[PDB]
Scaffold this active site. Structure first.
Site, PDB file in Angstrom:
ATOM      1  N   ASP B  25      -1.645 -14.793  -5.663  1.00 35.54           N
ATOM      2  CA  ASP B  25      -1.604 -14.239  -4.587  1.00 35.54           C
ATOM      3  C   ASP B  25      -2.424 -12.879  -4.277  1.00 35.54           C
ATOM      4  OD1 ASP B  25      -0.524 -12.634  -2.309  1.00 35.54           O
ATOM      5  OD2 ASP B  25       1.502 -12.348  -3.048  1.00 35.54           O
ATOM      6  N   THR B  26      -3.643 -12.945  -3.436  1.00 37.17           N
ATOM      7  CA  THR B  26      -4.676 -12.063  -3.055  1.00 37.17           C
ATOM      8  C   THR B  26      -4.251 -11.087  -2.172  1.00 37.17           C
ATOM      9  OG1 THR B  26      -5.299 -13.696  -1.101  1.00 37.17           O
ATOM     10  CG2 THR B  26      -6.600 -13.785  -3.216  1.00 37.17           C
ATOM     11  N   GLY B  27      -2.689 -11.255  -1.836  1.00 41.29           N
ATOM     12  CA  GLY B  27      -2.001 -10.103  -0.862  1.00 41.29           C
ATOM     13  C   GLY B  27      -1.309  -9.160  -1.975  1.00 41.29           C
TER      14      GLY B  27
HETATM   15  C1  LIG Z   1       4.280  -8.559  -4.651  1.00 42.12           C
HETATM   16  C2  LIG Z   1       3.777  -7.020  -4.422  1.00 42.12           C
HETATM   17  C3  LIG Z   1       2.787  -6.548  -5.524  1.00 42.12           C
HETATM   18  C4  LIG Z   1       4.690  -5.994  -3.974  1.00 42.12           C
HETATM   19  O1  LIG Z   1       2.754  -7.389  -3.281  1.00 42.12           O
HETATM   20  C5  LIG Z   1       3.219  -7.766  -2.455  1.00 42.12           C
HETATM   21  O2  LIG Z   1       4.461  -7.867  -1.754  1.00 42.12           O
HETATM   22  N1  LIG Z   1       1.981  -8.085  -1.529  1.00 42.12           N
HETATM   23  C6  LIG Z   1       2.350  -8.521  -0.177  1.00 42.12           C
HETATM   24  C7  LIG Z   1       1.148  -7.889   1.116  1.00 42.12           C
HETATM   25  C8  LIG Z   1       1.918  -6.535   1.326  1.00 42.12           C
HETATM   26  C9  LIG Z   1       1.278  -5.369   1.600  1.00 42.12           C
HETATM   27  C10 LIG Z   1       1.539  -4.030   2.137  1.00 42.12           C
HETATM   28  C11 LIG Z   1       2.652  -4.094   2.154  1.00 42.12           C
HETATM   29  C12 LIG Z   1       3.744  -4.950   2.046  1.00 42.12           C
HETATM   30  C13 LIG Z   1       3.121  -6.230   1.279  1.00 42.12           C
HETATM   31  C14 LIG Z   1       1.993 -10.079   0.145  1.00 42.12           C
HETATM   32  O3  LIG Z   1       2.386 -10.577   1.275  1.00 42.12           O
HETATM   33  C15 LIG Z   1       2.822 -10.987  -1.059  1.00 42.12           C
HETATM   34  N2  LIG Z   1       2.489 -12.159  -0.770  1.00 42.12           N
HETATM   35  C16 LIG Z   1       3.478 -13.365  -1.184  1.00 42.12           C
HETATM   36  C17 LIG Z   1       4.450 -12.485  -2.334  1.00 42.12           C
HETATM   37  C18 LIG Z   1       5.770 -13.371  -2.406  1.00 42.12           C
HETATM   38  C19 LIG Z   1       5.700 -14.839  -2.709  1.00 42.12           C
HETATM   39  C20 LIG Z   1       6.755 -15.533  -2.789  1.00 42.12           C
HETATM   40  C21 LIG Z   1       7.816 -14.984  -3.050  1.00 42.12           C
HETATM   41  C22 LIG Z   1       8.219 -13.605  -2.675  1.00 42.12           C
HETATM   42  C23 LIG Z   1       7.109 -12.956  -2.632  1.00 42.12           C
HETATM   43  C24 LIG Z   1       4.515 -13.286   0.039  1.00 42.12           C
HETATM   44  O4  LIG Z   1       5.472 -12.333   0.255  1.00 42.12           O
HETATM   45  N3  LIG Z   1       4.312 -14.362   0.654  1.00 42.12           N
HETATM   46  C25 LIG Z   1       5.453 -14.434   2.084  1.00 42.12           C
HETATM   47  C26 LIG Z   1       4.270 -13.757   3.170  1.00 42.12           C
HETATM   48  C27 LIG Z   1       5.345 -13.958   4.596  1.00 42.12           C
HETATM   49  C28 LIG Z   1       5.207 -15.043   5.137  1.00 42.12           C
HETATM   50  O5  LIG Z   1       4.607 -16.010   4.658  1.00 42.12           O
HETATM   51  O6  LIG Z   1       5.750 -15.350   6.383  1.00 42.12           O
HETATM   52  C29 LIG Z   1       5.667 -15.831   2.182  1.00 42.12           C
HETATM   53  O7  LIG Z   1       4.844 -16.830   2.224  1.00 42.12           O
HETATM   54  N4  LIG Z   1       7.034 -16.080   2.611  1.00 42.12           N
HETATM   55  C30 LIG Z   1       7.499 -17.380   3.048  1.00 42.12           C
HETATM   56  C31 LIG Z   1       7.960 -18.121   1.678  1.00 42.12           C
HETATM   57  C32 LIG Z   1       9.597 -17.367   1.261  1.00 42.12           C
HETATM   58  C33 LIG Z   1      10.722 -17.736   2.029  1.00 42.12           C
HETATM   59  C34 LIG Z   1      11.960 -17.279   1.677  1.00 42.12           C
HETATM   60  C35 LIG Z   1      11.976 -16.037   0.573  1.00 42.12           C
HETATM   61  C36 LIG Z   1      11.079 -15.861  -0.152  1.00 42.12           C
HETATM   62  C37 LIG Z   1       9.709 -16.419   0.350  1.00 42.12           C
HETATM   63  C38 LIG Z   1       8.438 -17.426   4.122  1.00 42.12           C
HETATM   64  N5  LIG Z   1       7.945 -18.286   5.102  1.00 42.12           N
HETATM   65  O8  LIG Z   1       9.276 -16.441   4.225  1.00 42.12           O
END
Ligand SMILES: CC(C)(C)OC(=O)N[C@@H](Cc1ccccc1)[C@H](O)CN[C@@H](Cc1ccccc1)C(=O)N[C@@H](CCC(=O)O)C(=O)N[C@@H](Cc1ccccc1)C(N)=O
Lengths: 99, 99
Positions: B25-27
């Site tokens: 995860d680059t984010g």
């Molecule tokens: C994890 C730490 C160290 C706290 O960093 C971040 O949170 N970084 C975030 C950037 C950020 C910057 C500033 C402020 C806040 C956040 C990235 O988005 C982290 N990338 C992944 C981390 C992750 C992956 C998997 C599970 C939990 C957490 C993410 O949330 N990805 C999301 C991005 C939002 C999106 O894609 O719409 C995702 O793919 N979520 C999917 C998958 C999902 C579904 C249900 C629950 C959990 C995950 C979704 N469609 O909801």
């Protein structure tokens, strides 16, 4: 280009005539932009992150320019702290992880 | 090697004698692992992503192996839905974004 990861992979994008900074996120399936003035119709959506969940606005086939590379695809708009460019757009602009 | 992003960029990690799957995860500034039997001393911490914040347990100088690549660093442990390899470790394996 090639980008190392000592800093956030933050980049310039252009969307709905506006210039914004956005984080290149390989951990995101979706592209999520902070509250912004976007034109068109949309559909209500729920998405998940590390903290819990948020409600977004689903915009489909939206044009966006990422670091000089153009792409069309879904853009979600809601209460996110950072602008996030996800794999739906990252595949588009032909981006890969390398190590 | 080179990883495209048509599917989540999931990799095999070994940590604390155990095998897991983790998301590149680059984010993420930081590495956050789900609850796991990890030995030693740690420190409370609070972190945020989309949805809000979680409290993790912070382990300094933990060895971890990522797709064959050894790295040592901070790993965070708490209520994350999935295993996340963050920029703290991604630099250590020379991982870059390319497009
Ligand atoms: C994890 C730490 C160290 C706290 O960093 C971040 O949170 N970084 C975030 C950037 C950020 C910057 C500033 C402020 C806040 C956040 C990235 O988005 C982290 N990338 C992944 C981390 C992750 C992956 C998997 C599970 C939990 C957490 C993410 O949330 N990805 C999301 C991005 C939002 C999106 O894609 O719409 C995702 O793919 N979520 C999917 C998958 C999902 C579904 C249900 C629950 C959990 C995950 C979704 N469609 O909801």
């Amino acid at each position: 280009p090639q980008i190392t990861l000592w800093q956030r992979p933050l980049v310039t994008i252009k969307i709905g005539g506006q210039l914004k900074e956005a984080l290149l996120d390989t951990g995101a399936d979706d592209t999520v932009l902070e509250e912004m003035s976007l034109p068109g119709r949309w559909k209500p959506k729920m998405i998940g992150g590390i903290g819990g969940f948020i409600k977004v606005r689903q915009y489909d086939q939206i044009l966006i320019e990422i670091c000089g590379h153009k792409a069309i695809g879904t853009v979600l708009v809601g209460p996110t702290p950072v602008n996030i460019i996800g794999r739906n757009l990252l595949t588009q602009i032909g981006c890969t992880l390398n190590f």
